[PDB]
């Protein structure tokens, strides 16, 4: 009956936005068991047009364009083509997280070793392009010194400071690292702080950290507290929630996802938009609950929401480890409120079922802005090149989707890949000799 008018979720049928699937590409062999831990196994260099994927075989690196195969009118969208031979970099231990620095020159790869614990390898992107080096070795490593509590659950490089990266571990601790020729720990917070997620402010001046107690705290890169965002009022003490993921969209605007504090997986995380007041407005914090925009069918995997803000379209793309679908929350014309877009059935982005009848779910999500291929859907219509949403599934398959935004005014976001000079390539500090 809809009813209450206050528990209502702002939603809009959106006909001017479409996800258009490209051919699915198998990157890794189907796993023996469904991956369950939090992971982020896809990274993209939009400066240089490269995609980095982590999996059983190790690290795979590809010229982004090589992974995108447009579906011709009629083609069977259920088909999967196999790997487009890229650069395979074997790793001694399984990777659970990959991320790239803002200058796209440093790639971090988090692994778990039974012997050594959780370790982060740092690669210089130039090494991958240096044909003079057959073996691609990291130039530095950072040991986290822990086991299960050492799994990296959230790690993000500062958007404006090339050497700065924030790391959150399963045990609740967080560390801010500086990576130049070597790795240096700038600041840390003990596990007692109970951090669950992190996100840098738009210009990288502050770091927001989500916490087990449901709050989001704004810190300086030195980890000096600056502001506290309260757990939303609609969350009672009888059912505590912890922050699962956070996206700092604008100075006073955040997308915050909350999940059951106990770590239960049957309860669906709530995606909430938070609008904070300027120490001027006298209005209280505004929290709008969007609940589950990505329907969570899976109850086996650790929750994760992969969130991305596309400033030029003023919208947030959302994917969830428990869902086969990608959803969009867009800011409305009043530039204050947000709305969930409901797309036409043929315009949705959904992951495929495996040849074993199981749904595939996201393990990594990135957006490519370097695509220069026009979209041909008919001999009468050809759309200009569009950005491509790319999801790496639990089945080892890359599922790309063109994002066609026909809403008024939205300009281009496409650019061509830059050329990467090998000058400045970092060398490992402790190489020795055989």
From Swiss-Prot:
This is Nuclear pore complex protein Nup214. It comes from Homo sapiens (Human). Residues 41-404 are annotated as: Seven-bladed beta propeller. Contains FG repeats. FG repeats are interaction sites for karyopherins (importins, exportins) and form probably an affinity gradient, guiding the transport proteins unidirectionally with their cargo through the NPC. FG repeat regions are highly flexible and lack ordered secondary structure. The overall conservation of FG repeats regarding exact sequence, spacing, and repeat unit length is limited. The beta-propeller contains long interblade connector loops, and mediates interaction with DDX19B. The lineage of its organism: Eukaryota, Metazoa, Chordata, Craniata, Vertebrata. The gene is NUP214. Expressed in thymus, spleen, bone marrow, kidney, brain and testis, but hardly in all other tissues or in whole embryos during development. It comes from the Eukaryota. Homodimer. Part of the nuclear pore complex (NPC). Interacts with NUP88. Interacts with ZFP36; this interaction increases upon lipopolysaccharide (LPS) stimulation. Interacts with DDX19. Interacts with XPO1. Interacts with XPO5. Signal peptide: none annotated. Blade repeats lie at residues 41-93, 94-150, 151-193, 194-239, 240-303, 304-359, 360-404. Probably glycosylated as it reacts with wheat germ agglutinin (WGA). The chain holds residues 1 to 434 of 2090 of the full protein. Part of the nuclear pore complex. Has a critical role in nucleocytoplasmic transport. May serve as a docking site in the receptor-mediated import of substrates across the nuclear pore complex. (Microbial infection) Required for capsid disassembly of the human adenovirus 5 (HadV-5) leading to release of the viral genome to the nucleus (in vitro). The modification Phosphothreonine is found at residues 416, 434.
């Amino acid at each position: 009956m809809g009813d209450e008018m206050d528990a209502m979720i702002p939603e809009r049928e959106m006909k001017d936005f479409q996800f258009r699937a490209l051919k699915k590409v198998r990157i890794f062999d189907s796993p023996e068991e469904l991956p369950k831990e939090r992971s982020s196994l896809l990274a993209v260099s939009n400066k240089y047009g490269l995609v980095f994927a982590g999996g059983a075989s190790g690290l795979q690196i590809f010229p982004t364009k090589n992974l995108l195969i447009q579906n011709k009118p009629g083609d069977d969208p259920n088909k999967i083509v196999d790997k487009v031979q890229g650069l395979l970099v074997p790793m001694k231990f399984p990777i659970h997280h990959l991320a790239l620095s803002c200058d796209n020159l440093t790639l971090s790869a988090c692994m778990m070793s039974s012997e050594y614990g959780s370790i982060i390898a740092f690669f210089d992107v130039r090494t991958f392009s240096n044909e003079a080096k057959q073996q691609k070795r990291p130039f530095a490593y950072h040991k986290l010194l822990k086991d299960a509590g050492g799994m990296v659950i959230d790690m993000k490089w500062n958007p404006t400071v090339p050497s700065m990266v924030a790391v959150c571990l399963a045990d609740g601790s967080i560390a801010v690292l500086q990576v130049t020729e070597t790795v240096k720990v700038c600041a840390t917070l003990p596990s007692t702080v109970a951090v669950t997620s992190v996100c840098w402010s738009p210009k990288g001046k502050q770091l927001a950290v989500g916490k087990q107690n449901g709050t989001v705290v704004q810190y300086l890169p030195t980890l000096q507290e600056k502001k506290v965002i309260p757990c939303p009022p609609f969350y009672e003490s009888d059912h505590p929630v912890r922050v699962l993921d956070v996206l700092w969209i604008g100075t006073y605007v955040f997308a915050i996802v909350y999940a059951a504090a106990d770590g239960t997986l049957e309860t669906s995380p709530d995606v909430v938009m938070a609008l904070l007041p300027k120490k001027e407005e006298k209005h209280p914090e505004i929290f709008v609950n969007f609940m589950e925009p990505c329907y969570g069918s899976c109850t086996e995997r650790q929750h994760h929401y992969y969130l991305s803000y596309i400033e030029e379209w003023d919208l947030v793309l959302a994917a969830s480890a428990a869902s086969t679908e990608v959803s969009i929350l867009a800011r409305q014309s009043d530039q204050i409120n947000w709305e969930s877009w409901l797309l036409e059935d043929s315009s949705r982005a959904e992951l495929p079922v495996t040849d074993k009848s199981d749904d595939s779910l996201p393990m990594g999500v990135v957006v490519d802005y370097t695509n220069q291929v026009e979209i041909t859907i008919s001999d009468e219509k050809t759309l200009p090149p569009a950005p491509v949403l790319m999801l790496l599934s639990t089945d080892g398959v890359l599922c790309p989707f063109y994002m066609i935004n026909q809403n008024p005014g939205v300009k281009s976001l496409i650019k061509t890949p830059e050329r990467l000079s090998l000058e400045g390539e970092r060398q490992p500090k402790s190489p020795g000799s055989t």
